[PDB]
Design a protein around this nucleic acid. Structure first.
Ligand SMILES: [Mg+2]
Ligand SMILES: [Mg+2]
Ligand SMILES: [Mg+2]
Ligand SMILES: [Mg+2]
Ligand SMILES: [Mg+2]
Ligand SMILES: [Mg+2]
Ligand SMILES: [Mg+2]
Ligand SMILES: [Mg+2]
Ligand SMILES: [Mg+2]
Ligand SMILES: [Mg+2]
Lengths: 135, 100, 65, 61, 141, 149, 214
RNA sequence: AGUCCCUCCCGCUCGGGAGGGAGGCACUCUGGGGGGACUGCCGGCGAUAAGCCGGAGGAAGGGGCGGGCGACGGUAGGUCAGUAUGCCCCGAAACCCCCGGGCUACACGCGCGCUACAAUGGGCGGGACAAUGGGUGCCGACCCCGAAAGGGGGAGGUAAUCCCCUAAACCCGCCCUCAGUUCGGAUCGCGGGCUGCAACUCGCCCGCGUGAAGCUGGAAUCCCUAGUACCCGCGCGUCAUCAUCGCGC
């Protein structure tokens, strides 16, 4: 009766994933992963599962709760959490190097955050400024 | 039978000193205490233009005041309640006591 | 017609009016003058091991300091 | 009182409404019911422009 | 069957357009009011205007004569609470033009502020005029 | 199978088709002449838009209940074009939502929790889940991965 | 409209957008070979992690490079085919989902019209549109003159991609053609050395002017 | 999250969901303390010094990234119309109140912006996902009435508890097919509301009607090196009412 929990973060989106023995059902906030839209977000989540292979895919069940951020930020956090759960559950080092060859960020995360704004057209950005005139 | 204690201050050290005094009082007797819980800090931020006139480039000040908080829950016992009523806070700490 | 491939073996330095040109030394890989080493002016970023396609192989750039 | 509303019982009278510097006569007619008095006493003079002076264009500075 | 030109209320209507959009050629009828009258007449707003039969055109004109009596709400007509009769009217074509002209003429007869602004060709609803609303020629210095 | 297992829009379409057999859902008399909010521009183009709005509201109550009028007014608002001024968000009006909720209660699908809002009764939950099961049975014939769920 | 088998499409192998394999694609040009990246990859979206490091754009899949290139307005401060093209609020700036859809539809059209693997046709286009000689400017007596120089492979690739995107952008502007159709037309024409392509004509002009100033 | 009790649903239930209660601090979060990166390791260049260039390991690599803090002086730069202050003036008016006007005028030149000139779209129905802040002269859920703007009652909240608060760009289906148009929405007519002691001069909002210039812009010229620029909305300040602005998200 094993249970494993993992965490993923990506620009204000936080995902908590739980993995256990099962028949191959993956849900994101209660929705089957096959119905996630748009397509560019569905493929972000499915990459580690495809890399792992069908034999490992069909022998587990994963439930992911994710909050904050946007639709692209939420998919990437879920992808990080799922990858970490997969490497911890099976504990095989061939897979861990395979994830790193394909995409390092799957396992070390992404530390980038927004930069705070500054005066002179503060609402647009930290570096964008007002048009300058001389006459 | 349990009392709730709230503390607040602009100085982080005095808050900890008063909380530690309470914790020592509770340990110095047989009484159960819900540990000092840190509540989110209040930030008051005010942004102002610097120059008195309107000539020159516009530059701004960002002034900030921070208020820290703690929360302690302990069961009301007369032997220990008098001791926590006898402790006197520094002038920059607010304390309130209520019965729940 | 299809040019001659050459391979970068050394970087010499920047030049041009705004510093946009680099002088390099290349070794011809094909054609009548295979194996010869000549210097050339290149526009764009370049590193050792790049391969250029020359439309002619008898012009050589003036050496810079 | 420039914000007084014209009422039917005021029809036929002549009222002098302040415009800022003097009182102008207004003769109340039936088709004025429902309007403020100030609408009939203009407070600005009509503009007849002269010749643009120095600094009116870029070249004149 | 199909007619490329159908005449309704004294305006020719393109026969290739959907009825709701064909109707907007009439001055005084926009897209919303047209859909309302199409629904009241019990006609599909997406049908081609060329398939109208004579009785349907007669019915449409009857509705356009007095919309309120045919179930169109009073807050939808373009001249509610008429200044002379007090009723809720909808005007189209020439009647609309002369009604608007009479309203402006009444404002001008009493020498009201808005009447003066209408006469001088200047903005009426309180706009600033130092920068914008320029229509003329640059003057020399 | 539950509502959580199928796409929202497809379920709304099926439910809107199904709601035309229930006698207590009849569009009011002013339905032909109104917009669904101050941020819109033209009237609805479907001659049966009332059933779509009612089905959407029922599914909304199923998922987020208990919920009141004001929050639904937030949900059905949107962005408005304001001529020469920049675009802005606005809420929808209240009559459509209130009348739809009252009709749904009259049909026995929702009930009122005092000071909290409206919630889905067991009958309404069964009503939606039946259609969801049928739609899923249809859908999994072309997406074999849906058979696990 | 679009069948449900396309709205909910699920892959099972690592291949470009889950639909096309790049194993049989080969690059003829010896100079461009180590810069066209063709490693297996499912999703062409790398979240801009390559801009920090020097030469880092070398290891970015070529389809993602094309997607980034078309994600633009098009004619901001220079004229393309005789016009500025300022779209502003109706451009594709920072909308990478729509660009992905445009590229996918263009690939499907290419596969339908020519029967070949679309990546191969794209590679042929960029091979034919990459110039080999460029020019630099000097000033004398208040007059500007041109001097011929050579081009590095990375700059060749960049110029080819930009020109293809600009040609596609110009063909759909205020005309009945759509963006995906224009992109397909431009790629096919460049792959066949047809002068009606914007990119191929630009390459010819650049090389001619460079030759006339050796 | 796992474990337990009850209730309600589906393919009739092996299985799969949703609420509530006990119960726990695991996970997220909040905030006190501590660790971690030093050109420390490796190979080159330079002098064998100061340093520079390139690699490993690493969450992070060479001011790690973004901010606060501006030396002795000058600019007879701005401010006595924020307050402090010398001299000169007015001192029954140049001081103190009240009423009505003006700062909102309009042949014209210029700065900074917003909306557009359409398909890299317009409309109609449906489906998704935030963060910063603020609230007792106030925030107001929830119920009722109205087509809308709004109207009548009103729980809880001095706030990690209650409320503002179910963003838009994005995705799916249908209509329009390169046209001064189902592009654009200036101008004006009629009617309905809110704040205020007062809405004409001179406020903001809603419904029906009306439908201007504009089809990509000469010579010139501005901003920006990474979660940056572009694109998209939101909060606070001002504030009885009013945001095409400022500062932030
Ligand atoms: Mg920003
Ligand atoms: Mg919507
Ligand atoms: Mg718009
Ligand atoms: Mg001075
Ligand atoms: Mg001075
Ligand atoms: Mg002024
Ligand atoms: Mg329009
Ligand atoms: Mg007024
Ligand atoms: Mg046009
Ligand atoms: Mg201001």
């Amino acid at each position: 009766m094993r249970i494993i929990q993992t965490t993923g973060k990506r620009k204000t989106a936080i995902a908590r994933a739980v993995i256990r023995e099962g028949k191959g059902r993956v849900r994101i906030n209660g929705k089957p992963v096959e119905l996630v839209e748009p397509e560019i977000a569905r493929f972000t989540i499915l990459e580690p599962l495809i890399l792992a292979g069908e034999e490992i895919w069909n022998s587990v069940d994963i439930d992911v709760k994710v909050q904050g951020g946007g639709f692209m930020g939420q998919a990437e956090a879920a992808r990080i959490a799922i990858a970490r759960a997969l490497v911890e559950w099976t504990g095989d080092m061939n897979l861990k190097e395979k994830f790193i060859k394909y995409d390092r960020t799957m396992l070390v995360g992404d530390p980038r955050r927004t930069e705070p704004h500054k005066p002179n057209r503060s609402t647009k950005g930290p570096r964008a400024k007002r048009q300058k005139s001389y006459r | 039978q349990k009392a709730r204690i709230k503390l607040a201050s602009t100085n982080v050290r005095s808050l900890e000193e008063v909380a530690n005094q309470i914790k020592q009082i509770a340990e110095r007797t047989g009484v159960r205490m819900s540990g000092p819980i840190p509540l989110p800090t209040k930030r008051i931020r005010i942004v102002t233009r610097k120059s008195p006139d309107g000539e020159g480039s516009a530059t701004f000040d960002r002034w900030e005041l921070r208020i820290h908080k703690r929360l302690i829950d302990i069961e009301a016992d007369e032997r220990a309640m008098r001791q926590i009523m006898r402790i006197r806070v520094p002038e920059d700490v607010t304390i309130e006591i209520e019965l729940i | 017609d299809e040019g001659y491939p050459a391979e970068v073996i050394e970087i010499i330095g920047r030049t041009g009016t705004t510093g946009d040109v680099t002088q390099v030394k290349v070794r011809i890989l094909e054609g009548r003058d295979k194996g010869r080493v000549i210097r050339r002016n290149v526009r764009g970023p370049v590193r050792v091991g790049d391969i250029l396609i020359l439309r002619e192989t008898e012009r050589e750039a003036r050496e810079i300091k | 009182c420039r914000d007084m509303i014209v009422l039917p019982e005021m029809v036929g009278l002549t009222i002098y409404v302040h415009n800022g510097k003097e009182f102008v006569p207004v003769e109340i007619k039936p088709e004025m019911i429902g309007h403020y008095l100030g609408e009939f006493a203009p407070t600005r003079k009509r503009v007849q422009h002269g010749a643009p002076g120095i600094g009116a264009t870029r070249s004149s500075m | 069957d199909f007619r490329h030109i159908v005449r309704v209320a004294g305006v020719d209507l393109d026969g290739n357009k959907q009825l709701r959009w064909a109707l907007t050629a009439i001055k005084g009828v926009g897209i919303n009011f047209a859909t309302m009258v199409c629904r009241v007449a019990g006609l599909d707003p997406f049908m081609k205007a060329g398939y109208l039969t004579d009785e349907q055109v007669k019915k449409i004109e009857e509705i356009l004569q007095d919309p309120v009596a045919h179930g169109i709400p009073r807050w939808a007509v373009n001249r509610p609470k008429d200044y002379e009769t007090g009723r809720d009217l909808h005007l189209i074509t020439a009647k609309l033009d002369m009604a608007i002209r009479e309203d402006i003429m009444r404002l001008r007869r009493i020498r009201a502020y808005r009447g003066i602004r209408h006469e001088l060709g200047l903005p009426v609803r309180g706009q600033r005029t130092r920068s914008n609303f320029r229509r003329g020629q640059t003057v020399g210095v | 199978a539950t509502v959580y297992d199928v796409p929202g829009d497809l379920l709304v379409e099926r439910v809107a088709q199904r709601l035309k057999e229930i006698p207590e859902i009849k569009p009011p008399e002013w339905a032909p002449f109104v917009k669904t909010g101050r941020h819109k521009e033209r009237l609805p183009e479907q001659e049966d838009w009332w059933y779509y709005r009612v089905a959407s509201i029922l599914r909304r109550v199923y998922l987020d209940g208990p919920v009141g009028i004001e929050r639904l007014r937030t949900y059905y608002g949107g962005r408005k074009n304001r001529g020469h001024a920049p675009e802005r968000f606005y809420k929808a009006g209240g009559s459509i939502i209130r009348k739809a909720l009252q009709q749904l209660e009259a049909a026995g699908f929702v009930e009122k929790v005092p000071g909290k809002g409206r919630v889905i009764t067991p009958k309404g939950r069964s009503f939606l889940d039946k259609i969801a099961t049928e739609l899923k049975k249809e859908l999994e014939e072309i997406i074999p991965e849906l058979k696990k769920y | 409209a679009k069948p449900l088998s396309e709205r909910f499409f699920i892959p099972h192998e690592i291949k470009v957008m889950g639909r096309w394999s790049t194993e049989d694609v080969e690059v003829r040009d010896p100079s461009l070979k180590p810069y066209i990246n063709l490693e297996p990859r499912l999703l062409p979206h790398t979240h801009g992690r390559h801009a920090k490091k020097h030469f880092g754009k070398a290891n970015v899949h070529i389809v993602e490079r094309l997607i980034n290139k078309i994600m633009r307005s098009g004619g901001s401060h220079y004229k393309v085919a005789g016009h500025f093209m300022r779209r502003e609020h109706r451009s594709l700036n920072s909308k990478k989902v729509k660009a992905y859809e445009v590229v996918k539809e263009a690939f499907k059209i290419i596969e339908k019209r020519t029967g070949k693997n679309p990546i191969q046709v794209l590679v042929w286009a960029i091979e034919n549109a990459a110039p080999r000689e460029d020019t630099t400017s000097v000033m004398f007596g208040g007059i500007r003159y041109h001097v011929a120089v050579d081009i590095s492979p990375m700059r060749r690739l960049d110029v080819a991609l930009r020109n293809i995107a600009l040609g596609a952008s110009a063909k759909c502007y205020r005309t009945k053609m759509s963006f995906a159709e224009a992109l397909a037309e431009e790629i096919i024409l460049a792959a066949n050395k047809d002068p009606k392509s914007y990119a191929y004509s630009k390459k010819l002009e650049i090389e001619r002017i460079a030759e006339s100033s050796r």
